[PDB]
Amino acid sequence: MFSNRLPPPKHTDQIAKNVKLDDFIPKRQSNFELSVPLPTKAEIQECTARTKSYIQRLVNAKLANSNNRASSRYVTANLLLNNSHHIEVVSKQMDPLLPRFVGKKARKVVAPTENDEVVPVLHMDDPNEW
């Protein structure tokens, strides 16, 4: 427009692939009224039941493996190997006067921190005062 008003003259992709601009940009700035809906009760109750059953299995495992005989008060066999063999799994009754877990000891372990996925850090761009 503006330039027309003047008179005429007389005289490769693998580099840093985990990093993308779509992750730095906030999604809601171009649309304030974007909805971020709460989960419905059909989601809440389902995952609540799933999580409750899992947590109660962990409580049961902690209780049942303790040495207190009263712990069971509050506690709420087949395999196929190499596709050919049917295995009947039993667990014979332990001598109650022997230690319940023969291999169990207090031993320290340094766990390996293995991780295949690199995580980006996503920042943006007078010293005598400090």
Partner 1 sequence: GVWTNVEDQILKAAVQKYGTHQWSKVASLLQKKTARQSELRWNEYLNPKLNFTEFSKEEDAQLLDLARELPNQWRTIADMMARPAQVCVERYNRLLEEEKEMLAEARARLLNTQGKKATRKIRERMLEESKRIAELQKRRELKQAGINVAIKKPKKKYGTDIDYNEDIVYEQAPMPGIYDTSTEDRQIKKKFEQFERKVNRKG
Partner 2 sequence: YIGNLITRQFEGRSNEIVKTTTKQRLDAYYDLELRNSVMDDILEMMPESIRQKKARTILQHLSEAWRCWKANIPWDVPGMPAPIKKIIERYIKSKADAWVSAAHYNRERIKRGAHVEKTMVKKNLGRLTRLWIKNEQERQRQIQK
Partner 3 sequence: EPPPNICEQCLGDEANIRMTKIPQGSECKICTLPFTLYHFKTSKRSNNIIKTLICVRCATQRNICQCCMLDSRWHIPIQLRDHLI
Residue 124 binds which entry of partner 3, partner 1, partner 2, none, CB below 5-8 Å type-dependent: none
Nearest one of 94, 64, 90 to 79, comparing CA atoms: 90
Q: Which is nearer to partner 2, 40 or 67 (CB)?
A: 67
Q: Which is nearer to partner 2, 36 or 98 (CB)?
A: 98
Dihedral sign computed on CA atoms, order 122, 128, 129, 130:
positive
Structure tokens at 7: 């008179």
Radius of gyration of the chain (CA): 32
Per-residue binding string, partner 2, 6-45, x by CB under 8 A, is: ----------------------------------------
CB 89 within 8 A of CB 78: yes
Residue 67 engages partner 2 in binding (rule: CB under 8 A) = yes
The site for partner 3 (CB under 8 A) is made up of 79, 81-82, 84-92, 101-105, 107, 109
